[PDB]
Design a protein around this ligand. Structure first.
Ligand SMILES: N[C@@H](CCC(=O)O)C(=O)O
Ligand SMILES: N[C@@H](CCC(=O)O)C(=O)O
Ligand SMILES: [Cl-]
Ligand SMILES: [Cl-]
Ligand SMILES: [Cl-]
Ligand SMILES: [Cl-]
Lengths: 242, 242
């Protein structure tokens, strides 16, 4: 069966990631960003009541998906990659954005791209990977033959700090946020190599969800009418670094 | 609920479009292309019996979707754009490819890009549009303010013939196949301007389909492991025109 979301309250899980979901203190928390604007465009068209819930600070991406599958949220919206392993336990809406990953490194590092990680120019333990990201499964399939021998990272902040401290030489990061951060916040970090792991971001929903069609039709309408493109431009066009 | 496709016969609708689905006459018909190779990857992994059925000549893409919604096929695989109006009546799998469209014209026509269409430089009745395509939708929303004032086209063959004969000045076409045909078949046709209508292709399935998860997990695995990229290279990375 199927139903419309009008008048229904949705508990919407979101996860910190600038400029998708930007968390500010003042004591109260304020949220802004692409995701918050997207929720408003969807709410206005669909008429649901939004109960927006920020995931706890240490939540991983795969942790957010698992929390939704456990019933902690009704949907989850963010820079959440659609993967085969995740699709076993949740459904995803039609895509809100294309995606791919880039290699992140300190400016000036003598890395040309992915071959240098797959040739062994960099020992495995100098490749940092954030646990519970889609990048972890890429690493395990493409670089290490299933061996869990990357340098483990608990957060974006640990990724940035470990690069700047010379503990790792590279990590992986989604292209949209990687460009944002390296063009606006960490001016001495940079990207290298071709894009890889072409993928999509989707809204996470329960499997076999009553409201699947209503959400999908509305996402596709926002795509067709240019709203998703406008939102991307609004939040991601900036380049502060000199 | 959900289930696996093993042993089940699926009536799979396909639609002629080189090099996705290539229809050859033999003395009967033989089908080849990206779509047929994709069907074999899915069949070998999932275990269904594939009953591949070619849509009649001049069937439009929205017509194929309507035929599936009416029960004429179980799934449909092709260069089928995911749209809001189609999603109202069928579901789509996870995307098999990104997409966008380009402006197609005969070499020597004085069109520089989309602004020429939007600024009235071309008579509306000399803009050819294949009805029942996503490009028709784009036309009605962005060019004509909802007016059905284009030159209607029943197929790609009519589009090519009409451009070459000077009956129309321009049309729209998906980028992958537009590149293929202008680089390999019609050396006197060409593409101009920026690409537009960024979109996706998906496998059409019934709404609330029992086998949705099985199909999606399998598509995502083909994506992640690089099979879809390999198929795209095999069928599209070719140029004959000088
Ligand atoms: N989009 C990623 C997280 C962000 C990143 O890896 O940069 C995921 O869903 O795992
Ligand atoms: N992909 C288009 C058809 C091909 C084209 O317009 O070039 C659709 O699904 O309507
Ligand atoms: Cl999609
Ligand atoms: Cl499902
Ligand atoms: Cl997808
Ligand atoms: Cl549905």
């Amino acid at each position: 069966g199927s139903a419309r979301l009008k008048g229904i309250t949705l508990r919407i899980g979101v996860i910190e990631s600038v400029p998708f979901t930007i968390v500010a203190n003042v004591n109260t928390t304020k949220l802004t960003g692409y995701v918050l604007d997207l929720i408003e465009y969807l709410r206005d068209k669909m008429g649901f009541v939004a109960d927006v819930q920020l995931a706890p600070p240490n939540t991983s991406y795969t942790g957010l998906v698992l929390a939704l599958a456990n019933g902690d949220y009704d949907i989850a919206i963010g820079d959440i990659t659609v993967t085969s392993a995740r699709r076993e336990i949740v459904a995803f809406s039609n895509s809100i954005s294309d995606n791919s990953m880039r290699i992140l490194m300190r400016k000036g590092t003598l890395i040309d791209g992915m071959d240098d990680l797959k040739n062994g120019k960099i020992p495995y333990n100098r490749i940092g990977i954030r646990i519970g990201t889609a990048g972890e499964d890429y690493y395990l399939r493409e670089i290490s033959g299933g061996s869990r021998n990357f340098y483990p990272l608990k957060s974006r902040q640990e990724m940035y700090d470990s690069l700047l401290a010379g503990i790792i030489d590279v990590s992986f990061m989604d292209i949209g946020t990687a460009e944002y951060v390296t063009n606006n916040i960490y001016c001495n970090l940079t990207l290298v190599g071709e894009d890889f792991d072409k993928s999509t971001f989707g809204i996470v929903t329960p499997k076999e969800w009553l409201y699947a069609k209503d959400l999908d039709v509305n996402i596709l309408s926002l795509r067709e009418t240019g709203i998703l493109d406008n939102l991307k431009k609004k939040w991601f066009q900036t380049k502060a670094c000199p």
